[PDB]
Amino acid sequence: LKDKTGRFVVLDKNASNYESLVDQEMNNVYERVMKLDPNQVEFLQAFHEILYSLKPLFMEEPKYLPIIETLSEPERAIQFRVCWLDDNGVQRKNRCFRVQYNSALGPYKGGLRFHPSVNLSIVKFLGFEQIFKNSLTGLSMGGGKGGSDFDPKGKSDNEILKFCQAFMNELYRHIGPCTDVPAGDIGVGGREIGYLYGQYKKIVNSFNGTLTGKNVKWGGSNLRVEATGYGLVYFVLEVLKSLNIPVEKQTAVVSGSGNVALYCVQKLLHLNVKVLTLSDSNGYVYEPNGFTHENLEFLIDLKEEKKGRIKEYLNHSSTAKYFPNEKPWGVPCTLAFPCATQNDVDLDQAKLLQKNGCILVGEGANMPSTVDAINLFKSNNIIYCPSKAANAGGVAISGLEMSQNFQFSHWTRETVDEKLKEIMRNIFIACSENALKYTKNKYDLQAGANIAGFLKVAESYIEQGCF
Amino acid sequence: LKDKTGRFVVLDKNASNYESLVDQEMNNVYERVMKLDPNQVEFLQAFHEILYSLKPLFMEEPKYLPIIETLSEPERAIQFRVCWLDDNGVQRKNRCFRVQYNSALGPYKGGLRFHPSVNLSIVKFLGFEQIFKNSLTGLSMGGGKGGSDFDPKGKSDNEILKFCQAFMNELYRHIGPCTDVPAGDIGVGGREIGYLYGQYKKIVNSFNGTLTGKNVKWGGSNLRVEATGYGLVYFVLEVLKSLNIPVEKQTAVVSGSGNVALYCVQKLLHLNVKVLTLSDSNGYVYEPNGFTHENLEFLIDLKEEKKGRIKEYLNHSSTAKYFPNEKPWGVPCTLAFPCATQNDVDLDQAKLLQKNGCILVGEGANMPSTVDAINLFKSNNIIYCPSKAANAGGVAISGLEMSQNFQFSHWTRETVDEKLKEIMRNIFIACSENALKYTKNKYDLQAGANIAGFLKVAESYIEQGCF
Amino acid sequence: LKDKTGRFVVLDKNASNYESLVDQEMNNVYERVMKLDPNQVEFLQAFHEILYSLKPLFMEEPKYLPIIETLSEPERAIQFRVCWLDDNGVQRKNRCFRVQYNSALGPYKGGLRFHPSVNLSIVKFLGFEQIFKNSLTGLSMGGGKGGSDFDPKGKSDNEILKFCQAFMNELYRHIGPCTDVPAGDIGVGGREIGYLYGQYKKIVNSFNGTLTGKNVKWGGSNLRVEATGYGLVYFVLEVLKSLNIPVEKQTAVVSGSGNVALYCVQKLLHLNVKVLTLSDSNGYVYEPNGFTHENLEFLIDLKEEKKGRIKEYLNHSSTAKYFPNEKPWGVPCTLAFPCATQNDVDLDQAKLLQKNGCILVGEGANMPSTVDAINLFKSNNIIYCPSKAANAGGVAISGLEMSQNFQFSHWTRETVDEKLKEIMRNIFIACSENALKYTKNKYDLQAGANIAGFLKVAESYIEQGCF
Amino acid sequence: LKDKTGRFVVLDKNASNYESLVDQEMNNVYERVMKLDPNQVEFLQAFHEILYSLKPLFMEEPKYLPIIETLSEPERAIQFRVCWLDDNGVQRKNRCFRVQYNSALGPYKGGLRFHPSVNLSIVKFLGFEQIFKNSLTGLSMGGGKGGSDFDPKGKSDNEILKFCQAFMNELYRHIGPCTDVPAGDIGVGGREIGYLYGQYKKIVNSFNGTLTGKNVKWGGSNLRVEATGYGLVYFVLEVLKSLNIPVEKQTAVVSGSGNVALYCVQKLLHLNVKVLTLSDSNGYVYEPNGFTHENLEFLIDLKEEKKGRIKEYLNHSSTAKYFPNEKPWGVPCTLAFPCATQNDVDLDQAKLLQKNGCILVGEGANMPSTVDAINLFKSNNIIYCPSKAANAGGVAISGLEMSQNFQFSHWTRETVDEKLKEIMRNIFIACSENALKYTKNKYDLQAGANIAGFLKVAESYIEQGCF
Fold this sequence. Notes:
This is part of a larger assembly, with 4 copies of chain A (467 residues). Chain A is built from 16 helices and 13 strands. Chain A is of the alpha/beta class and 467 residues long. The first copy, chain A, folds into 2 domains: 243 residues, no CATH class; 224 residues, NAD(P)-binding Rossmann-like Domain (Rossmann fold), CATH 3.40.50. In chain A, strands 1-2-4-3-5 form a 5-stranded mixed β-sheet. In chain A, helix 8 crosses helix 14. Chain A is globular and about 70 Å long. The first copy, chain A, starts with 17 loop residues before the first helix and ends with a helix. In chain A, 58% of the residues are buried. Strand 1 of chain A pairs antiparallel with strand 1 of chain B, so a sheet runs across the interface. Chains A, B, C, D: Keywords: NAD, Nucleotide-binding, Oxidoreductase. Chains A, B, C, D: Pfam families: ELFV_dehydrog, ELFV_dehydrog_N. Chains A, B, C, D: GO terms for molecular function: glutamate dehydrogenase (NADP+) activity; nucleotide binding. Chains A, B, C, D: Belongs to the Glu/Leu/Phe/Val dehydrogenases family. Chains A, B, C, D: One of its GO terms (cellular component) is cytosol.
């Protein structure tokens, strides 16, 4: 009837109709959550997603049923008003958030998002998954998220600043080095974090690592930009190594042109992998013979350094070719690296990839593969690497940024990279064993990432008592 | 094109189309507001409701359109999880809130409510109105509302303590003497305020007036239980005077058994007003000749004090009579005091009292009359007393308590009442003046209230700057 | 050799040479003071000035020489940079200050001044005098002055907001309800105090009386605009009484248009005193017969309220007359109220009023009379009312506001005035008593003021210990 | 007459009757201490113990006489009431402590003890010796201690929790990462510290190393459990190595069955030492041919993992034999490791050990050897290892836990162990030289531990001034 603590009700695993008890309870867990937040579509969907993914574990430790239902409720969610003067003198208003989700494993860690479509649900959605992503890095980090429906597009620097100072004029009172360390995300890059940190240090009068993603000149870490892109390739190399699949005999197709796709390709080239593409929301580019370090240098320190359109890539490669309004998925590969947007890969695209020889998918972006696409991948014996695990390197460097701020140190690029490789190996190791242990599959990384990331946060929550 | 401040956009009170723009831009303000909170039903209603009632004020001053739109958004809105052990030792969870709405006229003020029904929409609706209501008192009280979806019914006294301490372990960091002074409400009674004040003092190690509604032995104030009902009568007694209508010559049908009703009657009788009824969820009693001090006394000091039922009254008043599940609104009168529930009075009822000489409705509860009845009444020239005013006495004493804790003092029952009678008289003057000035009705108290409650707030906001 | 405390060195009031030592050691105290701040011209002047005026007090008590020397040094003096964006988007800079001078009788009290002329010397001079001036009020107010070399003239309302918020982002950490209560002054008006109070409340998240001079809707106090002028008359009206000179039988020439003058007149007329003049930078108007309530009214509610010029008065008083760039000091009188600028009255002017029956000078502004004129007046037995006293009403209401915010209360216009009239009467008693006791003049109010302002401070300091 | 600082009186070492001056002064030091706390038996005894132990040093640096008398007085001792609800709803009460003894070398470090017999004296007793133990680790740690007369035995988990949350509900305000870092002890194991940390993080809203002994999942260190047991063997290996006594030719007898005895034996086996026993408060177990890694695995992960009685050991070893109601001391050995309770080894037991060949005693527990037993050991040329030094490894890992929390790192088990070996070597080196230098004995570790541990704390106290 109850676990060792007595605070939690067991679901008698030796009853005659156990599985039905679990299923029906999982269902009541979802029904109550749904009722708490009926119209938070993005949130309810991510919860339902993890919830049922964990079923193998619930069958095992039913005590984790009451727990996940509770952890799905932010320890603290703060919504605040923020007013700022536009460059015309007109006073403006934006809705802001900062969901301090979980604090069992360490200070709340989660980025900030300034985007017209930001809202409670979506912030709660990124925050809930941020928990398990942070848990997987092995480091000491909780889970948070926040942002504003403030649209940076079309704004002067002076406006991004005033809004950044206004935002922190409220946010600071809820964050700190050992409380909640926000980071960047869509809308918040180095510039924003520079103004956010500036305002913070100005009000609180302290120079610390309350924000990650900072400039190497005042607290930042090396590899701050290559982290995600590298972690991704490291995670896939780790999967490839365990199956004994020669990495230098693989062909990769990558989408996106951000810092994730850019450095994924850079690490891919270093490992001697042939990269055939990169892409823009307008179209994708193709290099017949594969990409080059030089080519990647054009794309990088120009169509991100100047912010052009991947089309300009043609002014550098007479051998390249652009495809207006298309994704790279029709290009045969063994490795697919979705580093663009949400729902980048759909059903038909997973079919092309499937019939073209694709053997593994590395999620570079946030849930790039559609729900039907994942199913197609898993059903066709194609290794699926979960965002939570494969692109966790971006969060790892974050923790390493704090570690360097706490130690009042600044490690070399090589030291940080070595740690990023061992962290990514630890993540693959945790996802394999939990997957094998709970689904007997072993390469069902989606179940493994969720189980490992949840088990650590839950045991800890129980250990820390009622709160 | 802009106001003196050049921060808001003025509509141009001297353009041909003008009156249409005040109608469209208002429609526009409710648009964005609605798209922001698509499903906060109760919230959008109290907003739209105040929005349109204020058209008389926008007509003169259109600068107030951009403002109400900004003030509709809580300056801060904290949602938090709370876990407590129940009596069986099982760990429980509950969602909690504290919407700090506006702090222009003073610290955030507002009670907490623990009802299974509570949620953000409800809290915001109750919270938004708190602003203006607290504005009409004339004291320095900002607006705010709090609470949890926690249900006391069924809980032991020990459980309500465990929950209150758990509640405060999170809420203490967001409230304070000059920051947020929560109060009691539905679910939070003198006990719950005592248990919360207990945890607050234990953690923060400070004895002060962070909460109003405390026992008189440690911060409480005399007239705490009668302030609302008292002021309701004091407000009407003030409305009648300006009309030269002898208060001691009217008949009053009144609904309730809470403090609002139980003392509305106690003051009505003290002025020689004959009260024929008193209500309860199951029914309403009746006194042909009228209630006696001793009659009202048995009731008060016994049904509520012993928490029985209004029926039992028939064990004292062999003269009285019960009327199984019925609303007193039938019995004819001159002064009707709705003090039971929201929409206590519907339309048909508004028709009964209408055809029986009911000359003044004096709300004693939270929005007692339906959107219809208010129109019916207002359509037949029946004095309609706006909740924000008539029952403001509850908040009136709330700040008098603050004043007394702040002065490390404790006033006589007499002093408090004199200051109370005085406030309500000013509440009458503002509503009246304003009504006359903006709607030429002078007794369109529903408008006087909004226009006066919102003004002190809006000007102050403008004077305080962009925050 | 030493005082009761054995911490200071006593000169020996019974040594032959003694009177020389009090003259040398004083000369010595100004030496070190001067060598410390070699170029703070204004500062060294207010110090040397107070230093020597206090010789009557040292004569009896030489322990006070070491003390004044120590109190001449601010307990704390914060200087800070402030950067704000101007309307063109250009980033601007300004030096700022907050000299917390003495906290013996209470928290630090003193306005802020934003004038291109502001600097440490000026702030210290204004700040030093604030001490004693705030000492004579009898309230619990320590001394302090603040400000910036920032110039509002030419700035938009938006710019004054951006600067005020920037100002407070630094100043909030150094001020507070019971630490430092800044106020308005030249450059900081009800608007700037509103914009500063806005930022202070936004950052600290506390509604309180950290600043005096707030709007009445959120902390302000009645008689805020008249306190200074009022008390000036109330002080003189008090001086005359002790002399048995009928206030309603004198003629008064007065300079100004600020609140000090505009209401000095309003009270002078209310007591039936005939005021023939009112001044302005460009000139001074004249009423042969005297100003009328309606006359003074047009002026006040129109020239200052509409910020025009005293000339325009001739668009109401066809009886009056303007006197192009001239000081009213000519027109003969019995009571002259200098309330325009420093050194408003020179020597020659002090000769005109001298030969015309001017029997009492009553300073209404910051040091209005020249070192000469004071001597001239004092040399011809003309009652000289020390700025520190006559215009202390401004500070008087400053602390009444604090009292009111502290008591979460708001007094009537009547109450405040009665307490005001009362303070000024005590201010008269202290100065008088002291004057008589130390200089046998009883009407050497200039000395009475210093000796009484400094004493409450110095004794308190000694009683408080070595800090 | 006085040291270099002048704040301390010397005891002229060149006087004719110096030794008598010192003895008599040491005596006055004890007489005044005794009088301050007449009935704190445990405290007075530990003080007297160190005091006279240090005499060699006092003869040397008499300046340390006034100092030890002062350091014997807690910089701060806080006693607090703690109320909590038992599982029956009945409110309960317990007396709690937290003696923040010394802060010269770093943040107060000392465990918490929940035991029916806890009281000021005993807490002060553990705190006073904790100082010198911490000083010896070489790390930066002060000395503290605390606990409650709260009896954990017979309590539900839910009760240990409520009491743990109640305890911290007061304690938190006095502790912090850089102020006071409590740890575990009798009554407080991992479970308690888990609930103590949980409550702390909940109230203060910070994730830091305010408590050591945490779970490796949220801040803990590897070796957290093996530390004391290992440090002990390392310290003895270090002593053995310096005498050139082959460690793999020794025979050890161990008492206790806790984490100290368990891992002492584990390290002993690794070093190839023959272990013959372990024990329970009921009786001791004996392995004829010595213990095995496997055997130790039964005892360990079972009679500590399940918490049985060392008697059950027989269900695993057909070769073992239990001895009801006896201690291991009658078993011949060269090495004796008292890891049980206070006063474990008595006079007769030290005689058996003595006549049986014992050459060294390693104090695993707190003062296990009786006072007569130590004398017998020292008088018979038997190496006596002081609790303060030999079992200091348990405190060392503690400091390493903080170091890992500050660096936001998590070192491997091998890195922590290496540091534990060097720390234990540094301790032996400090105890040898100070012993040799002050008693010419060299292996009078009891004098050395006390001298070294005191010299560092005292020089520092002087360096830091009067407080």
